[PDB]
Coordinates of all heavy atoms in Angstrom, one line a residue:
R13 N 14.8 5.8 14.0 CA 15.4 7.1 14.2 C 15.2 8.0 13.0 O 15.1 9.2 13.1 CB 16.9 6.9 14.4 CG 17.3 6.3 15.7 CD 17.6 7.3 16.8 NE 19.0 7.9 16.6 CZ 19.5 8.8 17.3 NH1 18.8 9.4 18.3 NH2 20.7 9.2 17.1
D14 N 15.1 7.4 11.8 CA 14.8 8.1 10.6 C 13.3 8.6 10.7 O 13.1 9.8 10.5 CB 14.9 7.2 9.3 CG 16.3 6.7 9.2 OD1 17.2 7.2 9.9 OD2 16.5 5.8 8.3
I15 N 12.4 7.7 10.9 CA 11.0 8.0 11.0 C 10.8 9.2 12.0 O 10.0 10.1 11.7 CB 10.2 6.8 11.5 CG1 9.8 5.9 10.3 CG2 8.9 7.3 12.2 CD1 11.0 5.2 9.6
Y16 N 11.5 9.2 13.1 CA 11.4 10.2 14.1 C 11.8 11.6 13.6 O 11.2 12.6 14.1 CB 12.2 9.9 15.3 CG 11.6 8.8 16.2 CD1 12.4 7.9 16.9 CD2 10.2 8.8 16.4 CE1 11.8 6.9 17.7 CE2 9.7 7.8 17.3 CZ 10.5 6.9 17.9 OH 9.9 6.0 18.7
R17 N 12.7 11.7 12.6 CA 13.2 13.0 12.1 C 12.6 13.3 10.7 O 13.1 14.2 10.0 CB 14.7 13.0 12.1 CG 15.4 12.8 13.4 CD 16.9 12.9 13.3 NE 17.5 12.7 14.6 CZ 17.9 11.5 15.1 NH1 17.6 10.4 14.4 NH2 18.5 11.5 16.3
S18 N 11.6 12.6 10.3 CA 10.9 12.7 9.0 C 9.8 13.7 9.1 O 9.0 13.7 10.1 CB 10.4 11.4 8.5 OG 9.3 11.0 9.2
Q19 N 9.6 14.6 8.2 CA 8.5 15.6 8.1 C 7.2 14.8 8.1 O 6.2 15.4 8.5 CB 8.7 16.5 7.0 CG 10.0 17.3 7.0 CD 10.1 18.2 8.2 OE1 9.2 18.8 8.7 NE2 11.3 18.2 8.8
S20 N 7.2 13.6 7.6 CA 6.0 12.8 7.5 C 5.5 12.5 8.9 O 4.3 12.5 9.2 CB 6.3 11.4 6.8 OG 7.3 11.6 5.8
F21 N 6.4 12.2 9.8 CA 6.1 11.8 11.2 C 5.9 13.1 12.1 O 5.2 13.0 13.1 CB 7.2 10.9 11.8 CG 7.0 10.6 13.3 CD1 6.3 9.4 13.6 CD2 7.6 11.4 14.2 CE1 6.2 9.1 15.0 CE2 7.4 11.1 15.6 CZ 6.7 9.9 15.9
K22 N 6.6 14.2 11.7 CA 6.5 15.4 12.4 C 5.1 16.1 12.1 O 4.6 16.8 12.9 CB 7.6 16.4 12.0 CG 9.0 15.8 12.2 CD 10.0 16.8 11.7 CE 11.4 16.3 11.9 NZ 11.7 16.0 13.4
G23 N 4.6 15.8 10.9 CA 3.4 16.5 10.4 C 2.1 15.7 11.0 O 1.0 16.2 10.7
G24 N 2.4 14.6 11.7 CA 1.3 13.9 12.3 C 0.6 12.9 11.4 O -0.5 12.5 11.6
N25 N 1.3 12.6 10.3 CA 0.8 11.6 9.3 C 0.6 10.2 9.9 O -0.3 9.5 9.4 CB 1.7 11.6 8.1 CG 1.7 12.9 7.3 OD1 2.6 13.1 6.5 ND2 0.8 13.7 7.6
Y26 N 1.4 9.9 10.9 CA 1.3 8.6 11.5 C 2.0 8.6 12.9 O 2.5 9.6 13.3 CB 1.9 7.5 10.6 CG 3.3 7.7 10.3 CD1 4.3 7.1 11.1 CD2 3.7 8.4 9.2 CE1 5.6 7.3 10.8 CE2 5.1 8.6 8.9 CZ 6.0 8.0 9.7 OH 7.3 8.2 9.4
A27 N 2.2 7.4 13.4 CA 2.9 7.2 14.7 C 3.5 5.8 14.7 O 3.1 4.9 14.0 CB 2.0 7.4 15.9
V28 N 4.6 5.6 15.5 CA 5.2 4.3 15.7 C 5.3 3.9 17.1 O 5.9 4.7 17.9 CB 6.6 4.3 15.0 CG1 7.2 2.9 15.1 CG2 6.5 4.8 13.6
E29 N 4.7 2.8 17.5 CA 4.7 2.4 18.9 C 5.3 1.0 19.0 O 4.7 0.0 18.5 CB 3.3 2.4 19.4 CG 2.4 3.5 18.8 CD 2.7 4.9 19.4 OE1 3.9 5.1 19.8 OE2 1.8 5.7 19.4
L30 N 6.4 0.8 19.7 CA 7.0 -0.5 19.9 C 6.2 -1.3 20.9 O 6.5 -1.2 22.1 CB 8.5 -0.3 20.4 CG 9.5 0.5 19.6 CD1 10.8 0.5 20.2 CD2 9.5 0.0 18.2
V31 N 5.2 -2.0 20.4 CA 4.4 -2.8 21.3 C 5.2 -3.7 22.2 O 6.0 -4.5 21.7 CB 3.3 -3.6 20.4 CG1 3.8 -3.8 19.0 CG2 3.1 -5.0 21.1
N32 N 5.0 -3.5 23.5 CA 5.7 -4.3 24.5 C 7.2 -3.9 24.5 O 8.1 -4.8 24.7 CB 5.5 -5.8 24.3 CG 4.2 -6.2 24.9 OD1 3.6 -5.6 25.7 ND2 3.7 -7.3 24.3
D33 N 7.5 -2.7 24.1 CA 8.9 -2.2 24.1 C 9.7 -3.0 23.0 O 10.9 -2.8 22.9 CB 9.6 -2.4 25.5 CG 8.8 -1.7 26.6 OD1 8.3 -0.6 26.3 OD2 8.7 -2.3 27.7
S34 N 9.1 -3.9 22.3 CA 9.7 -4.7 21.3 C 10.2 -3.9 20.2 O 9.5 -3.2 19.5 CB 8.8 -5.8 20.8 OG 9.5 -6.7 20.0
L35 N 11.5 -4.1 19.8 CA 12.1 -3.4 18.7 C 11.8 -4.1 17.4 O 12.1 -3.7 16.3 CB 13.7 -3.3 18.9 CG 14.5 -2.3 18.2 CD1 15.1 -2.9 16.9 CD2 13.7 -1.1 17.9
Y36 N 11.1 -5.3 17.6 CA 10.8 -6.1 16.4 C 9.3 -6.2 16.2 O 8.8 -6.9 15.3 CB 11.3 -7.6 16.7 CG 12.8 -7.7 16.6 CD1 13.6 -7.3 17.6 CD2 13.4 -8.2 15.4 CE1 15.0 -7.5 17.5 CE2 14.8 -8.3 15.3 CZ 15.6 -7.9 16.4 OH 16.9 -8.1 16.3
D37 N 8.5 -5.4 16.9 CA 7.1 -5.4 16.8 C 6.6 -3.9 16.9 O 6.5 -3.3 17.9 CB 6.4 -6.2 17.9 CG 5.0 -6.7 17.5 OD1 4.6 -6.5 16.3 OD2 4.3 -7.2 18.4
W38 N 6.2 -3.4 15.7 CA 5.8 -2.0 15.6 C 4.3 -1.9 15.4 O 3.7 -2.6 14.6 CB 6.4 -1.4 14.4 CG 7.9 -1.2 14.5 CD1 8.8 -1.9 15.3 CD2 8.8 -0.3 13.7 NE1 10.1 -1.5 15.1 CE2 10.1 -0.6 14.2 CE3 8.5 0.6 12.7 CZ2 11.2 0.1 13.6 CZ3 9.6 1.3 12.2 CH2 10.9 1.1 12.6
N39 N 3.7 -0.9 16.1 CA 2.3 -0.5 15.8 C 2.3 0.8 15.1 O 2.5 1.9 15.8 CB 1.4 -0.5 17.1 CG 0.7 -1.8 17.4 OD1 1.0 -2.8 16.7 ND2 -0.2 -1.8 18.3
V40 N 2.2 0.8 13.8 CA 2.2 2.0 13.0 C 0.8 2.5 12.7 O 0.1 1.8 11.9 CB 3.0 1.9 11.7 CG1 2.8 3.1 10.9 CG2 4.5 1.6 12.1
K41 N 0.3 3.5 13.3 CA -1.0 4.0 13.1 C -1.0 5.2 12.1 O -0.2 6.2 12.4 CB -1.7 4.5 14.4 CG -0.8 5.2 15.3 CD -1.7 6.0 16.3 CE -2.8 5.2 16.8 NZ -2.4 3.9 17.4
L42 N -1.8 5.2 11.1 CA -1.9 6.3 10.1 C -2.9 7.3 10.6 O -4.1 7.0 10.7 CB -2.3 5.8 8.7 CG -1.5 4.5 8.2 CD1 -2.1 4.1 6.9 CD2 0.0 4.9 8.1
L43 N -2.4 8.5 11.0 CA -3.2 9.5 11.6 C -3.8 10.4 10.5 O -5.0 10.8 10.5 CB -2.4 10.3 12.6 CG -1.7 9.5 13.7 CD1 -0.8 10.3 14.5 CD2 -2.8 8.7 14.5
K44 N -2.9 10.9 9.6 CA -3.3 11.7 8.4 C -3.3 10.8 7.2 O -2.3 10.5 6.6 CB -2.4 12.9 8.3 CG -2.7 14.0 9.4 CD -1.8 15.2 9.2 CE -2.2 16.3 10.1 NZ -2.3 15.9 11.5
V45 N -4.5 10.5 6.7 CA -4.7 9.5 5.7 C -4.4 10.0 4.2 O -3.3 9.6 3.7 CB -6.1 8.9 5.7 CG1 -7.1 9.9 5.8 CG2 -6.3 8.0 4.4
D46 N -9.1 13.8 1.2 CA -9.1 14.1 -0.2 C -9.5 12.9 -0.9 O -9.5 12.8 -2.2 CB -7.7 14.5 -0.6 CG -7.6 15.1 -2.1 OD1 -8.6 15.7 -2.5 OD2 -6.6 14.9 -2.8
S47 N -9.8 11.8 -0.1 CA -10.3 10.5 -0.7 C -11.5 10.0 0.1 O -11.8 10.6 1.2 CB -9.1 9.5 -0.6 OG -8.6 9.4 0.8
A48 N -12.1 9.0 -0.3 CA -13.2 8.4 0.3 C -12.9 7.8 1.7 O -13.7 8.0 2.7 CB -13.9 7.3 -0.5
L49 N -11.7 7.2 1.8 CA -11.2 6.7 3.1 C -11.0 7.9 4.1 O -11.4 7.8 5.2 CB -9.9 5.9 2.9 CG -9.3 5.4 4.2 CD1 -10.2 4.5 5.0 CD2 -8.0 4.6 3.8
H50 N -10.4 8.9 3.5 CA -10.2 10.2 4.3 C -11.5 10.6 4.9 O -11.6 11.2 6.0 CB -9.6 11.2 3.4 CG -9.5 12.6 4.1 ND1 -10.2 13.7 3.7 CD2 -8.7 13.0 5.1 CE1 -9.9 14.7 4.5 NE2 -8.9 14.3 5.3
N51 N -12.6 10.3 4.2 CA -13.9 10.6 4.7 C -14.4 9.7 5.8 O -14.8 10.2 6.9 CB -14.9 10.5 3.5 CG -16.4 10.8 3.9 OD1 -16.6 11.6 4.9 ND2 -17.3 10.3 3.2
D52 N -14.3 8.4 5.6 CA -14.7 7.5 6.6 C -14.0 7.6 7.9 O -14.5 7.2 9.0 CB -14.5 6.0 6.1 CG -15.6 5.6 5.1 OD1 -16.5 6.4 4.9 OD2 -15.5 4.5 4.5
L53 N -12.8 8.2 8.0 CA -12.1 8.4 9.2 C -12.6 9.6 10.0 O -12.4 9.6 11.2 CB -10.6 8.6 8.9 CG -9.9 7.4 8.3 CD1 -8.4 7.6 8.3 CD2 -10.2 6.1 9.1
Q54 N -13.2 10.5 9.3 CA -13.8 11.7 10.0 C -15.0 11.3 10.9 O -15.0 11.7 12.0 CB -14.3 12.7 9.0 CG -13.3 12.9 7.8 CD -12.0 13.5 8.3 OE1 -11.7 13.7 9.4 NE2 -11.1 13.7 7.3
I55 N -15.8 10.4 10.4 CA -17.0 9.9 11.1 C -16.6 8.6 11.9 O -17.4 7.9 12.3 CB -18.2 9.7 10.3 CG1 -17.9 8.6 9.2 CG2 -18.6 10.9 9.6 CD1 -19.1 8.2 8.4
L56 N -15.3 8.4 11.9 CA -14.7 7.3 12.7 C -14.4 7.7 14.1 O -14.8 7.1 15.1 CB -13.5 6.7 12.0 CG -13.2 5.2 12.2 CD1 -11.7 5.0 12.3 CD2 -13.9 4.6 13.4
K57 N -13.7 8.9 14.2 CA -13.4 9.4 15.5 C -14.6 9.6 16.4 O -14.5 9.3 17.6 CB -12.7 10.8 15.3 CG -12.5 11.5 16.6 CD -11.9 12.9 16.3 CE -10.5 12.9 15.9 NZ -9.6 12.2 17.0
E58 N -15.7 10.1 15.8 CA -16.9 10.4 16.6 C -17.7 9.1 17.0 O -17.8 8.8 18.1 CB -17.8 11.4 15.8 CG -18.0 11.1 14.4 CD -19.0 12.0 13.7 OE1 -19.8 12.6 14.4 OE2 -18.9 12.2 12.5
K59 N -18.2 8.5 15.9 CA -19.1 7.3 16.2 C -18.5 6.2 17.1 O -19.0 5.8 18.1 CB -19.5 6.7 14.8 CG -20.2 5.3 15.0 CD -20.9 4.9 13.7 CE -22.2 5.7 13.5 NZ -23.0 5.1 12.4
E60 N -17.3 5.7 16.7 CA -16.7 4.6 17.3 C -15.1 4.8 17.4 O -14.4 4.7 16.4 CB -17.0 3.3 16.6 CG -16.5 2.1 17.3 CD -16.6 0.8 16.4 OE1 -16.8 0.9 15.2 OE2 -16.7 -0.3 17.0
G61 N -14.7 5.0 18.7 CA -13.2 5.0 18.9 C -12.5 6.3 18.4 O -13.1 7.4 18.5
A62 N -11.3 6.1 17.9 CA -10.5 7.2 17.4 C -10.5 7.2 15.9 O -11.3 6.5 15.2 CB -9.1 7.2 18.0
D63 N -9.5 8.0 15.3 CA -9.4 8.1 13.9 C -8.1 7.8 13.3 O -7.2 8.7 13.2 CB -9.8 9.6 13.5 CG -8.9 10.6 14.2 OD1 -8.3 10.3 15.2 OD2 -8.9 11.8 13.7
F64 N -7.8 6.5 13.0 CA -6.6 6.1 12.4 C -6.6 4.6 12.0 O -7.4 3.8 12.5 CB -5.4 6.3 13.4 CG -5.7 5.5 14.7 CD1 -5.4 4.2 14.8 CD2 -6.1 6.2 15.9 CE1 -5.6 3.5 16.0 CE2 -6.3 5.5 17.1 CZ -6.0 4.2 17.2
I65 N -5.8 4.3 11.0 CA -5.7 2.9 10.5 C -4.5 2.3 11.2 O -3.4 2.8 11.1 CB -5.5 2.8 9.0 CG1 -6.8 2.9 8.3 CG2 -4.8 1.5 8.7 CD1 -7.6 4.2 8.4
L66 N -4.7 1.3 12.0 CA -3.7 0.7 12.8 C -3.0 -0.4 12.1 O -3.6 -1.5 11.9 CB -4.3 0.2 14.2 CG -3.2 -0.2 15.2 CD1 -2.3 0.9 15.6 CD2 -4.0 -0.8 16.4
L67 N -1.7 -0.2 11.8 CA -0.9 -1.3 11.2 C 0.0 -2.0 12.2 O 0.4 -1.4 13.2 CB -0.1 -0.7 10.0 CG -0.8 0.1 8.9 CD1 0.2 0.6 7.9 CD2 -1.8 -0.8 8.3
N68 N 0.4 -3.2 11.8 CA 1.3 -4.0 12.7 C 2.5 -4.5 11.8 O 2.3 -5.3 10.9 CB 0.6 -5.1 13.4 CG 1.6 -6.0 14.1 OD1 1.8 -7.2 13.7 ND2 2.2 -5.5 15.2
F69 N 3.7 -4.1 12.1 CA 4.9 -4.5 11.5 C 5.6 -5.6 12.3 O 6.0 -5.3 13.4 CB 5.8 -3.4 11.2 CG 5.3 -2.4 10.1 CD1 4.3 -1.6 10.3 CD2 6.0 -2.4 8.9 CE1 3.8 -0.8 9.3 CE2 5.6 -1.6 7.9 CZ 4.5 -0.7 8.1
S70 N 5.7 -6.8 11.7 CA 6.5 -7.8 12.4 C 7.8 -8.1 11.7 O 7.8 -8.4 10.5 CB 5.7 -9.1 12.5 OG 6.5 -10.2 13.1
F71 N 8.9 -7.9 12.4 CA 10.2 -7.9 11.7 C 11.0 -9.2 12.1 O 12.3 -9.2 12.1 CB 11.1 -6.7 12.1 CG 10.4 -5.4 11.7 CD1 9.8 -4.6 12.6 CD2 10.5 -5.0 10.3 CE1 9.2 -3.4 12.2 CE2 9.9 -3.8 9.9 CZ 9.3 -3.0 10.8
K72 N 10.3 -10.3 12.4 CA 11.0 -11.5 12.7 C 11.3 -12.4 11.5 O 12.3 -13.2 11.6 CB 10.1 -12.3 13.7 CG 10.4 -11.9 15.2 CD 9.7 -12.9 16.1 CE 10.2 -12.8 17.5 NZ 10.3 -11.4 18.0
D73 N 10.6 -12.2 10.4 CA 10.8 -13.1 9.3 C 11.9 -12.6 8.4 O 11.7 -12.1 7.3 CB 9.5 -13.3 8.5 CG 8.6 -14.4 9.1 OD1 9.2 -15.5 9.3 OD2 7.4 -14.1 9.2
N74 N 13.2 -12.7 8.8 CA 14.4 -12.5 8.0 C 14.5 -11.1 7.4 O 15.2 -10.9 6.4 CB 14.5 -13.5 6.9 CG 15.1 -14.8 7.5 OD1 14.7 -15.9 7.0 ND2 15.9 -14.7 8.5
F75 N 13.9 -10.1 8.0 CA 14.1 -8.7 7.5 C 15.5 -8.3 7.8 O 16.1 -8.7 8.9 CB 13.1 -7.8 8.3 CG 13.4 -6.3 8.1 CD1 12.8 -5.6 7.0 CD2 14.2 -5.6 9.0 CE1 13.1 -4.2 6.9 CE2 14.5 -4.3 8.8 CZ 13.9 -3.6 7.7
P76 N 16.2 -7.5 6.9 CA 15.7 -7.0 5.7 C 15.8 -7.9 4.5 O 15.5 -7.5 3.4 CB 16.5 -5.7 5.5 CG 17.4 -5.6 6.7 CD 17.5 -7.0 7.3
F77 N 16.2 -9.1 4.7 CA 16.3 -10.1 3.6 C 14.9 -10.3 3.0 O 14.7 -10.3 1.8 CB 16.9 -11.4 4.1 CG 18.3 -11.3 4.6 CD1 18.5 -11.1 6.0 CD2 19.4 -11.4 3.8 CE1 19.8 -10.9 6.5 CE2 20.7 -11.3 4.3 CZ 20.9 -11.0 5.6
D78 N 13.9 -10.5 3.9 CA 12.5 -10.7 3.5 C 11.7 -9.5 4.0 O 12.1 -8.8 4.9 CB 12.0 -12.0 4.1 CG 12.7 -13.2 3.7 OD1 13.4 -13.2 2.6 OD2 12.7 -14.2 4.4
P79 N 10.6 -9.2 3.3 CA 9.8 -8.1 3.7 C 9.3 -8.2 5.1 O 9.2 -9.3 5.7 CB 8.6 -8.2 2.7 CG 9.1 -9.0 1.6 CD 10.1 -9.9 2.2

Side-chain angles (χ1 to χ4, degrees):
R13 290 264 282 177
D14 299 350
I15 277 65
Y16 283 143
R17 300 182 180 88
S18 73
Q19 301 300 317
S20 322
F21 176 91
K22 302 176 182 300
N25 294 164
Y26 63 91
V28 184
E29 327 284 29
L30 303 184
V31 21
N32 284 334
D33 307 318
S34 185
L35 200 265
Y36 289 80
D37 202 11
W38 294 20
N39 269 8
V40 173
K41 45 160 41 57
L42 311 176
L43 308 172
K44 288 180 170 53
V45 46
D46 190 33
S47 56
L49 177 54
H50 175 247
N51 178 26
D52 282 355
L53 294 189
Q54 316 300 0
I55 65 179
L56 210 214
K57 170 187 287 304
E58 47 175 337
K59 166 167 287 191
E60 183 188 23
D63 57 341
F64 58 79
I65 278 64
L66 188 62
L67 303 179
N68 174 250
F69 287 71
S70 179
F71 299 104
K72 271 188 162 52
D73 278 312
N74 281 148
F75 170 90
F77 300 91
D78 302 335

